[PDB]
Design a protein around this nucleic acid. Structure first.
Length: 71
DNA sequence: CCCGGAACTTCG
DNA sequence: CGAAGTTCCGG
């Protein structure tokens, strides 16, 4: 309820939620399901290299919403 | 603009 | 070394 640390966790969830389906799924399978890149690539039927960038780019989007928040 | 993937780099 | 993570040349 409005304390900074609380604003930050909500910002993380909210940003994951608004990501493009592929980025959201790739970051979700990695962070919440704890899957390996290999596994995620099978689930998403795509090259693992695409999993690498998708996860990278999903992380970037989360960080661009979080960094403007700390100190 | 929004990323796809593979090369390249770091980490466990 | 194998998995995770970073970068870049496209398309």
């Amino acid at each position: 309820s409005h304390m900074l640390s609380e604003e930050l966790r909500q910002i993380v969830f909210r940003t994951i939620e608004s990501l493009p389906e592929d980025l959201r799924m790739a970051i979700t399978l990695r962070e919440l399901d704890g899957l390996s890149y290999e596994e995620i690539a099978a689930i998403m039927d795509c090259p693992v290299g695409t999993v690498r960038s998708r996860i990278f780019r999903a992380r970037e989007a989360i960080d661009n919403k979080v960094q403007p928040l700390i100190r």
